[PDB]
Design an enzyme around this catalytic site. Structure first.
Site, short mmCIF file in Angstrom:
data_model
loop_
_atom_site.label_atom_id
_atom_site.label_comp_id
_atom_site.label_asym_id
_atom_site.label_seq_id
_atom_site.Cartn_x
_atom_site.Cartn_y
_atom_site.Cartn_z
N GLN B 26 0.73 -1.01 0.00
CA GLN B 26 -0.03 -0.09 0.11
C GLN B 26 0.63 1.28 -0.22
OE1 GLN B 26 -0.51 1.18 4.50
NE2 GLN B 26 -1.44 -1.04 4.20
N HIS B 119 4.04 11.76 -6.13
CA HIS B 119 2.86 11.02 -6.76
C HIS B 119 2.68 9.72 -6.78
CE1 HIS B 119 5.96 11.56 -10.22
NE2 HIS B 119 5.60 10.37 -10.41
N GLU B 165 0.19 10.62 -11.84
CA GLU B 165 0.86 10.41 -13.24
C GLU B 165 0.02 9.43 -14.10
OE1 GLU B 165 4.89 9.09 -13.07
OE2 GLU B 165 5.35 10.23 -14.87
N1 LIG Z 1 -4.05 10.34 12.77
C1 LIG Z 1 -3.24 9.27 12.04
C2 LIG Z 1 -4.30 8.09 11.78
C3 LIG Z 1 -3.78 7.05 11.05
C4 LIG Z 1 -3.09 6.19 11.91
O1 LIG Z 1 -2.87 6.60 13.26
N2 LIG Z 1 -2.68 4.98 11.75
C5 LIG Z 1 -1.77 4.10 12.43
C6 LIG Z 1 -1.83 2.80 12.04
S1 LIG Z 1 -3.43 2.18 11.35
C7 LIG Z 1 -3.40 0.41 12.01
C8 LIG Z 1 -3.70 -0.39 10.95
C9 LIG Z 1 -2.81 -0.64 9.73
C10 LIG Z 1 -2.98 -1.51 8.58
C11 LIG Z 1 -4.29 -2.05 8.66
C12 LIG Z 1 -5.22 -2.08 9.72
C13 LIG Z 1 -4.98 -1.10 10.95
C14 LIG Z 1 -0.34 4.49 12.35
O2 LIG Z 1 0.25 5.22 11.54
N3 LIG Z 1 0.46 4.68 13.76
C15 LIG Z 1 1.77 5.22 13.59
C16 LIG Z 1 2.38 5.02 15.05
O3 LIG Z 1 2.00 3.85 15.80
O4 LIG Z 1 3.47 5.64 15.33
C17 LIG Z 1 -2.72 10.08 10.81
O5 LIG Z 1 -3.18 11.29 10.61
O6 LIG Z 1 -1.66 9.46 10.41
N1 LIG Z 2 12.95 17.97 -9.99
C1 LIG Z 2 11.77 16.99 -10.18
C2 LIG Z 2 12.51 15.67 -10.89
C3 LIG Z 2 11.40 14.78 -11.38
C4 LIG Z 2 10.36 15.29 -12.47
O1 LIG Z 2 10.55 16.44 -12.95
N2 LIG Z 2 9.56 14.23 -13.09
C5 LIG Z 2 8.53 15.14 -13.86
C6 LIG Z 2 8.16 13.55 -14.96
S1 LIG Z 2 9.59 12.10 -15.18
C7 LIG Z 2 9.09 11.53 -16.97
C8 LIG Z 2 9.19 10.14 -16.67
C9 LIG Z 2 7.80 9.47 -16.25
C10 LIG Z 2 8.04 8.24 -16.24
C11 LIG Z 2 8.85 7.40 -16.97
C12 LIG Z 2 10.01 7.95 -17.45
C13 LIG Z 2 10.07 9.35 -17.39
C14 LIG Z 2 7.43 15.40 -13.48
O2 LIG Z 2 6.79 15.31 -12.30
N3 LIG Z 2 6.98 16.44 -14.04
C15 LIG Z 2 6.03 17.34 -13.45
C16 LIG Z 2 5.24 18.32 -14.42
O3 LIG Z 2 5.45 18.10 -15.74
O4 LIG Z 2 4.74 19.34 -14.02
C17 LIG Z 2 11.11 16.69 -9.05
O5 LIG Z 2 11.94 16.76 -8.01
O6 LIG Z 2 9.90 16.50 -8.95
ZN LIG Z 3 6.32 9.10 -11.69
ZN LIG Z 4 -0.68 1.81 6.42
#
Ligand SMILES: N[C@@H](CCC(=O)N[C@@H](CSCc1ccccc1)C(=O)NCC(=O)O)C(=O)O
Ligand SMILES: N[C@@H](CCC(=O)N[C@@H](CSCc1ccccc1)C(=O)NCC(=O)O)C(=O)O
Ligand SMILES: [Zn+2]
Ligand SMILES: [Zn+2]
EC number: 4.4.1.5
Lengths: 176, 176
Positions: B26, B119, B165
């Protein structure tokens, strides 16, 4: 607060046929030092570098990592590009040339103000054994498996400080 | 600047056998309004809501979206959780209760200072037709397919402003 299951479902629509073959291909993260990142993602997490692209005019490189078998990587350039970019669940590490040298530079992990992105997550067969090894390798932990309310779920950090959730799909229902 | 292919490879290690069954499960993104997000991801992008979890004590809900067939979703609760959390390439939308009401609140997309996350990207069969439909649906574009140097690659924004993208794996080598 929060939606009910019915309220959530009423906001969902069936997939339009035109979106039939779409696939979630990548998550892009900017990395300060690609050397540290490549070592972490391959050695520590077991991912494979499936494609590297450089854009000298724009001064940046893209590193694609995925849980793919190195032997499946096409040998032909153009064929490798289309294969790499059609794999799902890849990580696109963006290296802006020069950040490794700038001592003051660092990227934001999204978990402190201003928040947005949270983490990527890896499903593993065993959170405890996976984390035991991570400890041996000196990986930084945000949350060890048994810390906090949610036991058996961990959060580690990559070289840039991005959080990575470590979870076992087969034991999630047990905590939830 | 930037690493050479050889320099990059020397930083990569073979996958340790203990990481054999790991999978990138994820990418977590925080969403202000789950109603707007669920509509966008299902109706516009064609994803399926495969699991919803609420944590009332902590005041947050998790919405898992993935390109999965609705018919594959297990009927049994505990069985659906393990299936949903073992799918790869899912989006975990985190809804912190109350953000929809706070007019001043909004999440950071990582593409303005302080930068980090960039992204997520969707591979589609045809960038042009995919974008023609997105326009009809009133989707906000960061970059239309033929804008800029890179033609045939697009960037759209979700309700929270996160960049997505849009790319065709089979035509990437043509631009690169
Ligand atoms: N307020 C939180 C909400 C989300 C959150 O707290 N998620 C938990 C985990 S959510 C638990 C979970 C994960 C996968 C599937 C089910 C439940 C987390 O990231 N904890 C960090 C830590 O413990 O320091 C946020 O904005 O990040
Ligand atoms: N300085 C940039 C470097 C990366 C970048 O510029 N990537 C391009 C795309 S990289 C092109 C690419 C994607 C997939 C596979 C090969 C090449 C991008 O995000 N452009 C945004 C825009 O056009 O507004 C950053 O930090 O984000
Ligand atoms: Zn990309
Ligand atoms: Zn998670």
């Amino acid at each position: 607060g929060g939606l009910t299951d019915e309220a959530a479902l009423s906001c969902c629509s069936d997939a339009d046929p035109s979106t039939k073959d779409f696939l979630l291909q990548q998550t892009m993260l900017r990395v300060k030092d690609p050397k540290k990142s490549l070592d972490f993602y391959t050695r520590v997490l077991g991912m494979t570098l499936i494609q590297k692209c450089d854009f000298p005019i724009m001064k940046f490189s893209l590193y694609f990592l995925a849980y793919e078998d190195k032997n499946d990587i096409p040998k032909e350039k153009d064929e490798k590009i289309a294969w790499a970019l059609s794999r799902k669940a890849t990580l696109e590490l963006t290296h802006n040339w020069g950040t490794e040298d700038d001592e003051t530079q660092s990227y934001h992990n999204g978990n402190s103000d201003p928040r947005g992105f949270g983490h990527i997550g890896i499903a593993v067969p065993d959170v405890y054994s996976a984390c035991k090894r991570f400890e041996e390798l000196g990986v930084k932990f945000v949350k060890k498996p048994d810390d906090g309310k949610m036991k058996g779920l961990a959060f580690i950090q990559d070289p840039d400080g991005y959080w990575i959730e470590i979870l076992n799909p087969n034991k999630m229902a047990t905590l939830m």
